[PDB]
Amino acid sequence: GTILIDLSPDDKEFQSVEEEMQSTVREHRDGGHAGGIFNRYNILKIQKVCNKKLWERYTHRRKEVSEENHNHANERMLFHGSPFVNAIIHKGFDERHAYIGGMFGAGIYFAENSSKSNQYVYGIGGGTGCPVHKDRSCYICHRQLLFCRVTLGKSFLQFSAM
Amino acid sequence: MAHSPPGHHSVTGRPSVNGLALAEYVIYRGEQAYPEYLITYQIMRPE
C-alpha cells in the first residue's frame, strides 16, 4: 500500500528537507572511512512516502506515548540510513531493522546529523561500500536516506563519549 | 529488540567528547517511527 510522490525542487517542502539534509553534515572521527569523504550532497530526488496503514500504526502509538507523557509525544524529524530502506518504506519499521550491536542496545537508531545516517546506507561501518564499485566513498552510485517522523516520548539521557 | 529503560519510551545518546556532533536516538518499538521522506542523493567529492 505504499506510494511515492515526487516533490518538485520548487516546492517549499523539498527545499526545507534538502536544507536539513545539507546543514547537518559534519566531519566524522573515522576520517570518512564508513560514509565517505564529503562536505555536502547532490540531492537527486525527494519523495513523500504515503501509506495509510503504516501512518495509522504510527499515530496510534504516538497517542499511547503522548497519553503516558502529559500529552507530549516529543516528536522529532530524524535521519535513518539502512540497507533495508526499501523494506522499511513498504512494510514499516520493525525488529528486523534494529541495530543489534548498537551502543544503547538493540533498537532502531536515528540521527540528527544526516552524515551519521549516511555511514549506515551500505551497512554497519559502511559494510563493503557500494554494490557496484565496493567503495564506501563512492561519488557515482545513488544513495538513499529516510527522513523520519519519530516519537521519543520520555527519553532516557545517556551521556556518551562520541 | 531490547526494551526501553523502565519509565521511558526511547534513549537519547548525547555526545560528551565531540563538541560538534549532534544527538542520536534509539526507539525499541517500530511503531514509533514513520518514514516520511525518501531522499536519493550522491555524496560530493570536495573541491
Ligand SMILES: CCOc1ccc(-c2nc3ccccc3c(=O)[nH]2)cc1
Ligand atoms: C543490520 C544492521 O541494521 C542497521 C540498520 C540501521 C542502522 C543505523 N544505525 C545508526 C546508528 C547511529 C546513528 C544513525 C544510525 C542509522 O541511521 N542507522 C544500524 C544497523
Ligand SMILES: [Zn+2]
Ligand atoms: Zn559505486
